[PDB]
């Protein structure tokens, strides 16, 4: 079985959430490959199939559980299991399609959505942009129930789409960015729910090119400034890796060092 990390929304604290996200990072990568002080995810090339995924088992107040599968090469959620049924996003390529057959192999009902697990498609399905989808412990609790009830026809597609958008941000994005982990910690500490601001959205949208820009630069300066946004939406440019080191927890493998 692939490694399993557990988290519950029942009595979640900033400490329990932090421990969770730290454990997710530690399973995503060994931390052996580090560029400009930022750990890199394992290279798809050379990654055996028995080390390809990690499982995040989520529980809530209702004691309902679902298990998300995460690809260690990019921290993307590729599918989930609830009871005796597993659902996978439409794979991006043939190799990924084959890889996911190694997931949840004892489940008797496997399904593949016609849509991939990217924000653009999910937002369309949900009928809402990330900017308008609240995040926090409450939202996660509700997302877990929605995922759990999908197999029994108790969950509408738009709600499923929304729920995925919530889980992805609070798990994957938080894993990728210390800044986003911090934002979720704050929501939790104060028992608040709220949509992510532009600073969060812009980071999520830039993870790929940030990874590239960092691994590309020899001494740590950027040939072309990276544009990001503050909470208030105002744009600001980033000329070197210093500011990014405390913001990014890990990068996707782009090139060799």
């Amino acid at each position, epitope marked *: 079985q692939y490694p399993i990390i557990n988290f519950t929304t029942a009595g979640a604290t900033v400490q329990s959430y932090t421990n969770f996200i730290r454990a997710v990072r530690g399973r995503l990568t060994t931390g052996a490959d580090v560029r400009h002080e930022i750990p890199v995810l394992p290279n798809r090339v050379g990654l055996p199939i028995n080390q390809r995924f990690i499982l995040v088992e989520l529980s809530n107040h209702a004691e309902l559980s679902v298990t998300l599968a995460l690809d260690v090469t*990019n921290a993307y959620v590729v599918g989930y299991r609830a009871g005796n049924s597993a659902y996978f996003f439409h794979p991006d*390529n043939q190799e990924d399609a084959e890889a996911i057959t190694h997931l949840f192999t004892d489940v008797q009902n496997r399904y593949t959505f*016609a*849509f991939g697990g*990217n924000y653009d498609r999910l937002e369309q399905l949900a009928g809402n942009l990330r900017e308008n989808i609240e995040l926090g412990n409450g939202p996660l609790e509700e997302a877990i129930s929605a995922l759990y009830y999908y197999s029994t026809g108790g969950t509408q597609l738009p709600t499923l789409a929304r729920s995925f958008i919530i889980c992805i941000q609070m798990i994957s994005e938080a894993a990728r960015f210390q800044y986003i982990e911090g934002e979720m910690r704050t929501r939790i500490r104060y028992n608040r729910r709220s949509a992510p601001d532009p600073s969060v959205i812009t980071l999520e949208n830039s993870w790929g090119r940030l990874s*590239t820009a960092i691994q590309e630069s020899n001494q740590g300066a950027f040939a072309s400034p990276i544009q990001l946004q503050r909470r208030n939406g105002s744009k600001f440019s980033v000329y070197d890796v210093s500011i990014l080191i405390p913001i990014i927890a890990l990068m996707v493998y782009r090139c060799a060092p």
Partner: nanobody
Amino acid sequence: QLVETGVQSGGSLRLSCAASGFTLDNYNIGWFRQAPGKEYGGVSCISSDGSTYYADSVKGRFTISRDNAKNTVYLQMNNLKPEDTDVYYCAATKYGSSCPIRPYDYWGQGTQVT
């Protein structure tokens, strides 16, 4: 930024993907469908070399090309069928395989083809 621009059963179309701010020369570029169904990966891709990839279903019909000058990438779509109806979009990644894998460095909004 990547911006895309560009029919009766059997007709053709020419999709274009223009990059603003940077040059597509050093990027792996791929065209993709919003709903591939039973197939996976790009519709057609070009290496950052300059090999090209084509999905079996479009071989002999589609041709992808680069115009370094104007700094855009073209997708020629001949002998179109009803089943080709979909949203097509442009995605670029600087390193890795000829067909960009998520996460992309850059991608476009995509256009509809019926």
